Design an enzyme around this catalytic site. Structure first.
Site, PDB file in Angstrom:
ATOM      1  NE  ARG A 126     -19.042 -24.724 -23.117  1.00  0.00           N
ATOM      2  CZ  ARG A 126     -19.320 -24.039 -22.008  1.00  0.00           C
ATOM      3  NH1 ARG A 126     -20.581 -23.776 -21.682  1.00  0.00           N
ATOM      4  NH2 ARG A 126     -18.337 -23.617 -21.212  1.00  0.00           N
TER       5      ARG A 126
ATOM      6  CD  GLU B 278     -20.341 -15.638 -26.303  1.00  0.00           C
ATOM      7  OE1 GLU B 278     -20.958 -14.738 -26.919  1.00  0.00           O
ATOM      8  OE2 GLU B 278     -19.125 -15.865 -26.478  1.00  0.00           O
ATOM      9  CG  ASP B 279     -20.842 -20.911 -22.569  1.00  0.00           C
ATOM     10  OD1 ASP B 279     -21.573 -21.445 -23.431  1.00  0.00           O
ATOM     11  OD2 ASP B 279     -19.636 -21.210 -22.421  1.00  0.00           O
ATOM     12  CB  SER B 280     -25.572 -16.640 -19.781  1.00  0.00           C
ATOM     13  OG  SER B 280     -26.526 -16.037 -18.925  1.00  0.00           O
TER      14      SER B 280
END
Lengths: 52, 263, 103, 207, 328, 64, 103, 119, 51, 176, 45
Positions: free
Chosen positions: E223, E50-52
């Site tokens: 995204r 998750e976005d990392s």
């Protein structure tokens, strides 16, 4: 982190070494609890302050 | 029987092929060579005067990575020093750490260009001496100077493995490729319009089968024949690394046995 | 329940990210430590990531398998995916409370 | 080794009369004869342990040895002591000083403290009497200063030859962590204090 | 040369690889913000979620995104009076009052520190004094926030007007990448480091290189940021070419175009590659999109953002706890 | 400032391989492709000499 | 533990019986409660008894053997072991027979 | 600032490198915990340990990529041991390693001659 | 029968997550997330996945 | 009664080959080097050094070599450690000698795995035998049984002369 | 008192406490400070 139980939270030592969390002296602790002090406030398994 | 089938060699890499052995051992050799293989490297600088442009902090990190000769290493007392951690001496001593010097000044007005050449060991033919990857050059670049910008550095190397800092591994990378066609289908190639048509055959592909049929595919078959290709930095001869790879890999299996048959 | 890793961030559990509607975009999260042994009890017996996996907002769960572990489930719950005896074994060491018996 | 102990002066005029109240009712008498060397480790930097205990104390028991025999200095039995200090807030209570009771076996003896480089300092000789009660014992004192450095020949030098008999009940704990021998031996030796109280007045002194 | 508070530079800056024909003017290639990183989008472990992102320790060890953090302390010499002096004399624990937890043991006879003395903690660097037996010397000297460390670049002592002395101290503090630092590409892939795997663990494959950092595939489809992809297919193509591949906003250059340019060097006309696991050696079932790009070392690091309280100072008027910073 | 020395991904030394690099793309009429003549088969690190900025010639001229 | 007393005191007994005919009974080749019996001076041909039961179990592995149940096997002593050797000579002739059966 | 000490990756802090301890559940099966050495030694005694017909299970897995260790469970069942199964394995390994350590030191100088010399 | 996806291991109505919670309370309930989120992550590690 | 400890480049087998021998067994043979370093300088070398190793001849005297390298005094304490601990003294990578001495007959073989603080060093071997003979009337013949069972990759180090002498001889390998 | 160094010339100004901040054989009025001796402990990482 994928490796902690759900109800788990990784707390960095840097912080753990600066919190508390009093905790009165039980007759069940005296020995266990003492080791902490004799250790030091700079050693995770340690403490700061002693109240009388 | 055999076990290895080398092809080409050079002065910085060693292309060859494993034979009768298992996948595990292969990888477990890839890893070994990329990590736990004792080497010399500098791991402490004291600065006196430095009025150059690279900060002290920035030099330490740079003076570090510059490779050094190691050769034998695991063969004391001389021609090999044991880790400076478990040494019979105190703090730091030449008996377990090689001293290096750097006294660079300026006699010009144009521009200076100090390479790995200008350093000075001690004369204990350890070594020792860094290296000169460059062709008839003088070694890897360290720093530049203009007018009066002399720096004075004391460097001493210790012994360490990649694990402890990527600085040590005398090993660039490794290039394995077991089963180059797709016997065991250990991989599902993404199409996109036609399978065996998008993905390039590999140079190492011309050493096998099993095109045609429709056998159908086997399964009692384990991955054997591994096409590795070790490349060293130039710190220690091109294997070396490999040779010294198993020597401290056997001894890593032993540790185990001895901790189970004694009791 | 704390404990206790190194490196200076709060490691927390991905399936718990939905309730905090916030990714790892470099977000901060606050920690409040209890003192008295009488609150330590409240936030143990009533408020607990476990006893809070189902808000009554909707009498529906608020946490669930999401992100990579989820993408993974599909690509593994397929009856196209067999497991070599070779492990199995390896993967059996999570459960984490294992019968001990190999399936 | 946590020694537990007290102190009480006995004038020599009443001394042997006290011994009649002692040795007839106790183990001993045992004359003591042990040559000290309390070498001081003059060392750098501060804060030095600097405490009197921190200074070394080689302890040559020689009570069976001749007063003139020459082999003594490194053949007759020696010892060594730093010892911990007696406990803080040990008011009237028997002092509790942990003890390293060293022993040794070589023709070289003293030398190692100078192999540690430690300097010579004050010296004397335990020379009193001791009366047993199992592991516990009383040790009334005589500590004459030797006539010359490393000389076993009498007369020696008490601060007065009207020498005080520094009576000294004691015991030696193996380890202070348990309450057992604490209250136990303190009780037994408090009763020993009741025994001496029939003829003396012992007291704690800070150490 | 510029003494300046809060400055952040790069040990090793690099040209954006795939860049637009509109930087020659932005003087951008001459002073890059970027740094090119063999990136590989893999779902591997679970720490890059998750976005990392998870970065290779071997690399950060040789200098990936290593930065410096100069901070500079300004201090003049006010004088009201009458004629009240206030020199940078070294405080004397003989009539000061008051200042503890020094140590002033690091000040010269000049009352100022000499570069480059390893300064850490709440150490002090200058010393003040203000008149009022043994009286009277005060202390209006400035310490050093504990949260900072490292050596001292240089100090500059000049004159003000005003009409007294005027000192400036600058200290440098290398900063390495650590779990919890921010990085993001040039497409708004705000990422943070989740883990630092050493060289062996990472998917050494098959060439065999190793990803410098690896982002997770779920930071794509939702995204929609197909540019991040393209850039990586193109960066790669400045492989066996070096032809600085232009990334100009509207040009004839297409995916289908760069692709042909790909197998042209022996690789897969689509970016992909086969990948070997770091633990076992097993090929990965799926094919990885491995391909360079430059990520930006964002500011605001972690060691500056951690905070912990516990019976700390408090306001005077309200008697509640102070605000962020201070101490703390 | 100056070549990184040791590529970011592998270990392949690059401190040596620049005093010689620059003496081709501006002194031998060979392409960016010429580095291939320096043993740069991998991506990899070879985007090291290539994506680099010479920030020292233009920093060195501030003489104290 | 009483069984320990049994086997141990009997061990000492047999050690006294182990004197003449130095049947060393070194326990390295197996650590069983069954307990090794051996021989002086010595490829190896094993020697085992238990009940006591005279099961000449020469083994390596497991060599070809021969078995008897003579004597009440409570009382000793050394002479009985000498009889065991007397059997073991015929056993050597039998070793020659083992050479005969090989082809 | 909270970076664990690297040297505490290659040095057992008074921690017993190996530890052998049965389980319960499972019956005739124990669990080995080698420390400060993993992800290499482990993989071998597996893709090789499982090659002995005597075996019925082969654990192996690092609990957390921060602690530098790893466990290993073996079940067998039924006669011995299994401290002996893994050693019989380890032994079969060291000896299988030299098989190649020798071929290497043998074929090296052998293809060193074809690229000129001389002597 | 069938295949596990968000339909069943996500906050669904009659969701599998919902269904052991709620029979038999958190834990082994609390363990559910630890198992799958541990087993699978472990599978995926060596299965590889990407785009 | 000549001493002859031998270091070896081929360990492990002592635990394995000696039991494989058909002959008899006795008890423990373990001993421990313990390097020292004074917490300050001054006492650096020679008579007044950082150097020290109490030497654990566990097998018989149970008495440490209270020796600052060639400083001859001996004692069991231990308590002396704490005495030495007066804001003082540290350690260094000593290598302990531990093992496995066994009854044999005319001679007997001491055996010990050797252990650096870096886990391993390398096994030592020894064989006590009757001392009335001159040094090599049968010592090589004793070494026939260093080849029976056969022993391999031996180090050249040769300490030479009951066993108390081995104490000084420890240094012969310690100084290495 | 100590020594100081000018921003341009760099010549040793060796100037006294409480005076005027400037130089000697030149101009400008600033000045930095000589680096201490000083053999400083520096890890190479």
């Amino acid at each position: 982190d994928p490796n902690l139980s759900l109800d788990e939270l990784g707390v960095p030592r840097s912080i753990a070494k600066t919190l508390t969390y009093p905790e009165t002296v039980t007759p069940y602790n005296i020995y266990q609890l003492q080791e902490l002090v004799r250790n030091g406030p700079d050693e995770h398994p340690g403490a700061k302050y002693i109240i009388r | 029987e055999t076990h290895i089938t080398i092809r080409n060699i050079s002065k910085n890499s060693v292309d060859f092929v494993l034979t009768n052995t298992s996948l595990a051992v292969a990888n477990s050799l890839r890893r070994v060579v990329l990590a736990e293989i004792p080497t010399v490297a500098i791991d402490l600088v004291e600065i006196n005067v430095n009025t150059s442009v690279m900060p002290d902090e920035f030099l330490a990190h740079r003076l570090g990575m510059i490779p050094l000769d190691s050769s034998n290493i695991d063969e004391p007392p001389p021609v090999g020093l044991e880790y400076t951690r478990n040494c019979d001496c105190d703090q730091y001593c030449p008996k377990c750490s090689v001293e290096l010097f750097l006294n660079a000044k300026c006699t010009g007005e144009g521009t200076m260009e100090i390479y790995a050449r200008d350093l000075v060991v001690s004369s204990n033919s350890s070594l020792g001496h860094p290296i000169l990857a460059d062709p008839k050059s003088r070694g890897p670049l360290i720093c530049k100077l203009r007018k009066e910008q002399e720096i004075s550095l004391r460097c001493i190397a210790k012994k360490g493995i990649a694990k402890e800092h990527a600085k040590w591994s005398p090993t660039s990378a490794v290039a394995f490729e077991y089963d180059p066609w797709n016997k065991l289908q250990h991989t599902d190639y993404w199409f996109e319009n036609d399978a065996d048509a998008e993905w390039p055959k590999s140079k190492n592909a011309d050493w096998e089968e099993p095109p045609r049929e429709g056998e159908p595919f086997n399964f009692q078959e384990e991955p054997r024949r591994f096409y590795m290709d070790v490349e060293s930095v130039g710190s220690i001869p091109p294997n070396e690394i490999m040779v010294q790879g198993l020597r401290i890999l056997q001894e890593k299996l032993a540790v185990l046995v001895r901790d189970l048959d004694e009791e | 329940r704390i404990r206790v890793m190194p490196y200076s961030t709060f490691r927390l559990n991905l399936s718990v990210t939905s309730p905090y509607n916030a990714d790892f975009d470099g977000d901060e999260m606050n920690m409040h430590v209890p003192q008295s042994e009488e609150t330590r009890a409240e936030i143990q017996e009533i408020t607990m990531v476990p006893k809070q996996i189902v808000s009554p907002q909707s009498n529906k769960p608020v946490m669930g398998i999401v992100q990579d572990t989820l993408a993974g489930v599909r690509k593994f719950s397929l009856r196209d995916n067999f497991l070599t005896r070779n492990a199995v074994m390896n993967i059996m060491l999570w459960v984490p409370d294992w019968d001990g018996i190999l399936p | 080794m946590q020694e537990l102990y007290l102190l009480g002066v006995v004038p020599s005029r009443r001394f042997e009369a006290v011994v009649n109240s002692l040795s007839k009712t106790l183990d001993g008498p045992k004359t003591i004869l042990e040559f000290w060397v309390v070498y001081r480790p003059k060392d750098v930097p501060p804060n030095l342990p600097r405490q009197p205990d921190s200074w070394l104390r080689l302890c040559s028991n020689i009570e069976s040895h001749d007063e003139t025999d020459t082999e003594w200095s490194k053949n007759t039995q020696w010892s060594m002591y730093l010892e911990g200090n007696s406990e803080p807030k040990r008011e009237d209570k028997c002092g509790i000083r942990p003890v390293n009771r060293a022993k040794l076996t070589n023709g070289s003896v003293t030398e190692f403290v100078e192999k540690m480089g430690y300097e010579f300092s004050h010296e004397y000789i335990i020379q009193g009497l001791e009366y047993f009660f199992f592991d516990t014992t009383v040790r009334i004192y005589q500590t004459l200063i030797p006539s010359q450095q490393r000389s076993i020949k009498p007369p020696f030098h008490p601060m007065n030859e009207e020498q005080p008999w520094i009576l000294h009940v004691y015991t030696h704990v193996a380890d202070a962590s348990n309450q057992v021998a604490m209250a136990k031996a303190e009780a037994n030796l408090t009763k020993v204090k009741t025994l001496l109280s029939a003829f003396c007045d012992l007291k704690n002194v800070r150490l | 040369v510029r003494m300046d508070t809060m400055a952040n530079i790069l040990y090793y800056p690099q040209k954006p690889l795939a860049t637009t024909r509109s930087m020659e003017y932005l003087k951008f290639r001459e002073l890059p913000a970027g740094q090119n990183a063999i990136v590989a989008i893999l779902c591997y472990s679970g720490y890059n979620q998750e976005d990392s992102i998870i970065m290779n320790q071997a690399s950060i060890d040789r200098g990936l995104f290593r930065s410096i953090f100069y901070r500079t302390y300004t201090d003049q010499e006010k004088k009201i009076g009458m004629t009240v002096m206030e020199e940078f004399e070294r405080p004397v624990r003989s009539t000061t009052l008051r200042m503890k937890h020094g140590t002033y043991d690091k000040l010269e006879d000049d009352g100022l520190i000499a570069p480059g003395t390893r300064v850490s903690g709440e150490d002090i660097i200058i010393g003040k004094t203000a008149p009022i037996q043994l009286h009277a010397k005060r202390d209006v000297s400035t310490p050093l926030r504990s949260t900072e460390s490292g050596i001292v670049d240089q100090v500059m002592v000049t004159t003000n007007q005003e009409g007294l002395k005027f000192v400036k101290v600058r200290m440098r503090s290398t900063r390495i990448p650590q779990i919890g630092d921010k990085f993001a590409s040039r497409h708004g892939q705000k990422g943070t480091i989740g883990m630092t795997y050493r060289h062996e663990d990472m998917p050494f494959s098959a060439q065999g290189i190793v990803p410098d950092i690896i982002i997770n595939p779920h930071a794509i489809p939702s995204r929609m940021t197909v540019a991040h992809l393209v850039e990586c297919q193109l960066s790669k193509v400045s492989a066996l070419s070096g032809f600085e591949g232009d990334a100009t906003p509207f040009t004839d250059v297409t995916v289908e175009a760069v692709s042909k340019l790909l197998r042209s060097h022996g690789f897969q006309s689509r970016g992909f590659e086969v990948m070997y696991h770091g633990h076992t050696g097993r090929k990965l079932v799926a094919q990885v999109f491995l391909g360079p790009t430059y990520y930006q070392r964002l500011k605001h690091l972690v060691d500056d953002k951690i905070h912990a309280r516990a019976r700390g100072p408090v306001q005077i008027l309200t008697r509640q706890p102070v605000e962020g910073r201070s101490r703390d | 400032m100056i070549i990184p020395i040791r590529c970011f991904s592998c270990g392949k030394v690059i401190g040596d391989k620049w005093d010689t690099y620059l003496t081709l793309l501006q002194e031998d009429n060979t392409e960016g492709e010429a580095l291939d003549k320096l043993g740069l088969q991998r991506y990899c690190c070879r985007r090291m000499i290539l994506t680099h900025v010479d920030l020292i010639e233009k920093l060195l001229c501030y003489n104290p | 533990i009483l069984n320990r007393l049994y086997f141990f005191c009997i061990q000492t007994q047999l050690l006294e019986v182990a004197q003449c005919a130095e049947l060393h009974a070194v326990q390295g080749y197996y650590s069983f409660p069954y307990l090794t019996f051996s021989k002086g001076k010595w490829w190896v041909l094993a020697y085992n008894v238990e009940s006591n039961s005279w099961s000449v179990r020469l083994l390596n592995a497991a060599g070809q053997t021969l078995y008897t149940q003579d004597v009440h096997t409570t009382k000793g002593t050394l002479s009985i072991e000498s009889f065991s050797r007397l059997s073991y000579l015929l056993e050597v002739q039998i070793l020659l027979f083992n050479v005969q059966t090989a082809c | 600032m909270n970076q664990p000490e690297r040297y505490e990756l290659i040095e057992l802090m008074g921690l017993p490198k190996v530890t052998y301890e049965l389980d319960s559940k499972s019956p005739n099966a124990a669990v080995v915990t080698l420390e400060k050495e993993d992800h290499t030694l482990a993989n071998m005694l597996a893709n090789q340990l499982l090659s002995d017909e005597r075996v019925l299970f082969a654990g192996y897995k690092v609990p957390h990529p921060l602690n530098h260790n790893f466990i290993l469970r073996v079940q067998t069942v039924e006669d011995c041991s299994p401290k002996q199964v893994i050693v019989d394995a380890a032994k079969s390994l060291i000896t299988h390693l030299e098989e190649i350590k020798v071929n290497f030191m043998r074929e090296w100088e052998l293809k060193m001659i074809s690229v000129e010399g001389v002597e | 029968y069938g295949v596990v996806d968000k339909k069943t291991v996500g906050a669904s109505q009659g969701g599998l997550v919902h269904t052991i919670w709620k029979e038999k309370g958190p834990e082994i309930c609390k363990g559910f997330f630890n198992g799958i989120q541990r087993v699978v992550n472990y599978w995926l590690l060596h299965n590889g996945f990407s785009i | 009664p000549v001493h002859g400890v031998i270091y070896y480049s081929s360990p492990s087998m002592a635990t394995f080959l000696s039991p494989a021998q058909d002959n008899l067994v006795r008890t423990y043979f373990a001993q421990h080097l313990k390097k020292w370093v004074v917490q300050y300088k001054l006492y650096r070398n020679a008579v007044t050094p950082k150097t020290l190793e109490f030497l654990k001849q566990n097998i018989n005297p149970s008495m440490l070599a209270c020796v600052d390298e060639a400083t001859m005094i001996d004692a069991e304490p231990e308590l002396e450690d704490i005495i030495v601990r007066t804001k003082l003294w540290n350690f260094r990578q000593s290598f302990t000698i531990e093992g496995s001495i066994y009854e044999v007959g005319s001679f007997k073989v001491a055996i010990a795995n050797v252990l650096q603080k870096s886990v391993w060093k390398g096994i030592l071997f020894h064989v006590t035998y009757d001392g009335t003979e001159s040094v090599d009337l049968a010592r090589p013949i004793i070494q026939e049984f260093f080849l029976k069972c056969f022993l391999q990759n031996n180090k050249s180090v040769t300490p030479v002369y009951l066993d108390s002498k081995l104490l000084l001889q420890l240094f012969k390998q310690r100084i290495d | 008192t100590m020594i100081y160094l000018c921003a341009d010339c760099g010549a040793r100004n060796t100037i006294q406490a409480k005076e005027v901040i400037r130089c000697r054989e030149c101009g400008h009025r600033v000045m930095y400070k000589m680096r201490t001796k000083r053999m400083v402990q520096f890890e190479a990482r």
